[PDB]
Amino acid sequence: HMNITDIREQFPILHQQVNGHDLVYLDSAATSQKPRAVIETLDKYYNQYNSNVHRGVHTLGTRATDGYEGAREKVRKFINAKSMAEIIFTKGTTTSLNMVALSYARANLKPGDEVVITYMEHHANIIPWQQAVKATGATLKYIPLQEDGTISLEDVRETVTSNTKIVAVSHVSNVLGTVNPIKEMAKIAHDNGAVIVVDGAQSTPHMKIDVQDLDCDFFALSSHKMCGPTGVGVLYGKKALLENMEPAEFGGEMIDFVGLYESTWKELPWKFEAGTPIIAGAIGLGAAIDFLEEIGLDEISRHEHKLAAYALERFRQLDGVTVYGPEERAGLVTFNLDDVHPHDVATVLDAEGIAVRAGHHCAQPLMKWLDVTATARASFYLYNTEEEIDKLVEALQKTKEYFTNV
Amino acid sequence: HMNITDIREQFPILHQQVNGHDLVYLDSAATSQKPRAVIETLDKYYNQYNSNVHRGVHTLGTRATDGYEGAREKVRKFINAKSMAEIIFTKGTTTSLNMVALSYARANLKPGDEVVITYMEHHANIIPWQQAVKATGATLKYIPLQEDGTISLEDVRETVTSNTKIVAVSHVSNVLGTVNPIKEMAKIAHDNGAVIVVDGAQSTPHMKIDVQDLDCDFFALSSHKMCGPTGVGVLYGKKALLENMEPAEFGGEMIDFVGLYESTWKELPWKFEAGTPIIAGAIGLGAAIDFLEEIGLDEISRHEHKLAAYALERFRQLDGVTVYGPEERAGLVTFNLDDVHPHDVATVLDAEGIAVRAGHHCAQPLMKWLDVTATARASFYLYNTEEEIDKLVEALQKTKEYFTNV
Numbered sequence: 001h002m003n004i005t006d007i008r009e010q011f012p013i014l015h016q017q018v019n020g021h022d023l024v025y026l027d028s029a030a031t032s033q034k035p036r037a038v039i040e041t042l043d044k045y046y047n048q049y050n051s052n053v054h055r056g057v058h059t060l061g062t063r064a065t066d067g068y069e070g071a072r073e074k075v076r077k078f079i080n081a082k083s084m085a086e087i088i089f090t091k092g093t094t095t096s097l098n099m100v101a102l103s104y105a106r107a108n109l110k111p112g113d114e115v116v117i118t119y120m121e122h123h124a125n126i127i128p129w130q131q132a133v134k135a136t137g138a139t140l141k142y143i144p145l146q147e148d149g150t151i152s153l154e155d156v157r158e159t160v161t162s163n164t165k166i167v168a169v170s171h172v173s174n175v176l177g178t179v180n181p182i183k184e185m186a187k188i189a190h191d192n193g194a195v196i197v198v199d200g201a202q203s204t205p206h207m208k209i210d211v212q213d214l215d216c217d218f219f220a221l222s223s224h225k226m227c228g229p230t231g232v233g234v235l236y237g238k239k240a241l242l243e244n245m246e247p248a249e250f251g252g253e254m255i256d257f258v259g260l261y262e263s264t265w266k267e268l269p270w271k272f273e274a275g276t277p278i279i280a281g282a283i284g285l286g287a288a289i290d291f292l293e294e295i296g297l298d299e300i301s302r303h304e305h306k307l308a309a310y311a312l313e314r315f316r317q318l319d320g321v322t323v324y325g326p327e328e329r330a331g332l333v334t335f336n337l338d339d340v341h342p343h344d345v346a347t348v349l350d351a352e353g354i355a356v357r358a359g360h361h362c363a364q365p366l367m368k369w370l371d372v373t374a375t376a377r378a379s380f381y382l383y384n385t386e387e388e389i390d391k392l393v394e395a396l397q398k399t400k401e402y403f404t405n406v
Numbered sequence: 407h408m409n410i411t412d413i414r415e416q417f418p419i420l421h422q423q424v425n426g427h428d429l430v431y432l433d434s435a436a437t438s439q440k441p442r443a444v445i446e447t448l449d450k451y452y453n454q455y456n457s458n459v460h461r462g463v464h465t466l467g468t469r470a471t472d473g474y475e476g477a478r479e480k481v482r483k484f485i486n487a488k489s490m491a492e493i494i495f496t497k498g499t500t501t502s503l504n505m506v507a508l509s510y511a512r513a514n515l516k517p518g519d520e521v522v523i524t525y526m527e528h529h530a531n532i533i534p535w536q537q538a539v540k541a542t543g544a545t546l547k548y549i550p551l552q553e554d555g556t557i558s559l560e561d562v563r564e565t566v567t568s569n570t571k572i573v574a575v576s577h578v579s580n581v582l583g584t585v586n587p588i589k590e591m592a593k594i595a596h597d598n599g600a601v602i603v604v605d606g607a608q609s610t611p612h613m614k615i616d617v618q619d620l621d622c623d624f625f626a627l628s629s630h631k632m633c634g635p636t637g638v639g640v641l642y643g644k645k646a647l648l649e650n651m652e653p654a655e656f657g658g659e660m661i662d663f664v665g666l667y668e669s670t671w672k673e674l675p676w677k678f679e680a681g682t683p684i685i686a687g688a689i690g691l692g693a694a695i696d697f698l699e700e701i702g703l704d705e706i707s708r709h710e711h712k713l714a715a716y717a718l719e720r721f722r723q724l725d726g727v728t729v730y731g732p733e734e735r736a737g738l739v740t741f742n743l744d745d746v747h748p749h750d751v752a753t754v755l756d757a758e759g760i761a762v763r764a765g766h767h768c769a770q771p772l773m774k775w776l777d778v779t780a781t782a783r784a785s786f787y788l789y790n791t792e793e794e795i796d797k798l799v800e801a802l803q804k805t806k807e808y809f810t811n812v
């Protein structure tokens with residue numbers, strides 16, 4: 001089984017004090033921390049074999065290219081894609097989803113067509129569709145949520161129609177912790193003639209992804225949430241869809257022939273990788289994948305289920321605290337204290353060393369659905385512990401006591 | 407003055423052998439190497455204060471945000487922009503130019519309008535314009551080149567007309583080493599009612615940039631060519647132009663309000679930074695700027711002019727070698743050996759430890775203008791030396807002798 005002391009020992013940033021207290025980092029849904037294996041991968045790249053890729057074929061250039069494409073194959077295996085042609089390196093989840101909205105949705109929507117999303121989506125999985133339907137005259141529709149913040153398949157079936165061309169939905173909600181029924185929703189989308197776009201930013205770090213079992217048409221993820229470098233992500237798309245989509249960006253490395261007025265594109269995946277690519281970051285993301293696979297995603301999921309179940313229980317021990325979302329969940333808890341604004345909660349918690357996020361978490365329509373303007377969110381990863389949750393609930397208790405006194 | 411031994415001591419990657427020979431890295435136009443000051447900046451970020459920015463305002467989140475925006479101010483000062491609102495962090499030069507083609511050109515071109523570029527442009531400054539004119543029904547035009555590969559202002563004046571809306575041009579050619587007369591071309595563009603887009607990927611690393619003196623409307627650059635991390639670049643644009651352009655990507659952090667169907671955008675620069683940004687890479691690019699400014703861009707330019715003048719002289723000592731471009735130039739030499747294909751030249755040179763690039767250098771129309779299919783290119787930076795140029799010319803001599811014997 002996974003030893004949380006031995007795992008934490010690999011993350012230098014955890015071992016420091018904030019405002020005189022041991023750091024308690026509970027904001028991994030915003031971004032995760034890195035183990036030495038990843039940081040030292042970046043170091044070794046810049047110390048030893050940095051060079052541009054797919055260009056000069058001298059010795060360092062070959063090493064960098066092999067490292068970059070080797071990381072692409074690591075990603076392919078990690079999400080169980082059929083082919084490296086289906087694995088596109090991007091700047092992050094947000095850019096991946098925007099590439100689908102630009103190159104697939106804007107080429108495949110007509111008036112009368114529908115894009116169907118849900119009220120729990122992150123802005124990254126809302127605004128690109130708002131913009132694509134405006135540009136095409138198509139219609140945007142929202143699957144309603146059950147009272148506990150889950151999605152019923154009956155509601156999916158009612159909302160998706162024979163006019164739906166795209167269903168876009170999160171694998172895991174960054175606010176509710178809901179794990180959505182992506183595989184069953186893919187069947188519903190296909191049955192109606194639609195493709196499904198899966199926002200996997202919060203699922204990929206925490207649980208095994210098998211795109212062949214999910215049968216998603218597109219799947220987007222971010223390195224910085226899964227122990228990898230900032231600035232890099234992946235767009236997966238079924239090869240037959242990517243073959244028919246035009247590039248979202250144009251430039252070097254993604255062309256075959258350039259004339260004065262017309263150009264032709266490389267084969268996949270490079271068709272979608274204009275310019276010098278995110279070489280070091282992609283290689284470090286491959287290192288993050290090796291790190292997570294050595295621990296075991298199923299072990300990481302089990303650890304997070306234990307932390308989530310413990311946190312929910314201990315939150316129920318606090319009077320005057322509201323928790324949003326379902327009992328079965330990913331590793332995060334979004335909440336409010338009665339009569340204390342979440343920004344103030346976050347301030348007091350940081351004074352105790354505890355990092356959480358307050359605000360709308362880039363999900364304003366969901367806050368409106370919840371009938372709140374803001375919330376506070378503690379989120380967990382493989383380096384967090386029950387003792388840290390104890391510190392969180394103790395600090396919420398003392399926050400309530402403090403704000404009741406004055 | 408700058409001490410090249412002390413500068414090289416800071417670049418760990420230079421100190422190694424390739425195929426039994428000291429490495430001679432002459433491919434900095436493809437990508438530059440990094441000093442410890444930059445690599446250690448990334449280390450310190452991941453070891454000590456990684457957190458997402460402009461989101462959770464806990465202690466590490468504040469440190470990361472301050473580091474990210476502090477790097478933006480470093481860039482602003484470095485290119486002498488008036489305002490941080492004008493400094494957009496992107497994935498690289500290619501993405502920056504594509505954002506201009508998407509958000510400015512496609513919104514501002516009608517049939518009859520012209521985009522004017524030159525035959526020496528890199529593909530990154532060709533294809534986005536090809537695509538924008540096709541999408542708008544506008545016309546793409548090319549300023550011709552003089553016999554030495556420079557641009558005469560008379561030709562600029564003849565090509566730009568009152569129908570030109572955009573002139574796009576490189577500051578420095580990655581093939582010819584030409585430094586183009588950007589400031590005078592900006593006056594010509596403005597006189598005709600056009601904006602000028604400057605591709606500064608090869609100028610920014612090597613010479614001071616002052617966008618107020620150049621009066622360029624847009625200016626694009628890449629971190630990885632100027633001792634900075636991969637995966638990051640800058641788009642500069644005059645504030646009044648950026649204010650009127652729509653975002654190229656949509657998502658978190660670049661919104662003010664998100665409704666079900668409509669959203670409003672943040673102020674500049676964040677309007678153009680969708681999603682979690684390239685936090686570590688931007689901070690490391692700020693470190694690269696501090697490093698270069700401490701050495702002095704004018705010292706770096708002088709050093710490169712000495713290396714270029716020495717290389718041109720020594721190339722003229724070789725029989726049967728053709729060099730392309732003008733005598734006054736940036737720090738690079740593109741050439742061919744009579745009767746030896748440039749790919750074979752590059753192979754033999756790598757066997758001697760020497761890294762150069764062979765091919766079309768992402769400038770196919772320029773190769774056609776030069777009446778060649780490919781070339782070889784040695785390119786210099788602040789860690790290179792005359793002794794390395796000696797090794798290059800000696801190895802070209804022995805390449806000629808070898809291929810004449812068989």
Ligand SMILES: Cc1ncc(COP(=O)(O)O)c(CN[C@@H](CS)C(=O)O)c1O
Pocket residue numbers: 029030031092093094095122124125170172173174199201202222224357361362458461658680681682683
């Ligand atoms: C479900 C979901 N979908 C898309 C994204 C955007 O991922 P990027 O790597 O920013 O591009 C995120 C990232 N949500 C972060 C940062 S806003 C959080 O604090 O909740 C997400 O949670």
Ligand SMILES: Cc1ncc(COP(=O)(O)O)c(CN[C@@H](CS)C(=O)O)c1O
Pocket residue numbers: 052055252274275276277435436437498499500501528530531576578579580605607608628630763767768
């Ligand atoms: C004049 C010019 N303009 C745009 C670019 C593209 O920069 P990126 O950082 O790849 O996006 C480059 C990069 N030319 C490299 C790599 S193809 C070379 O080996 O010559 C350039 O030289």
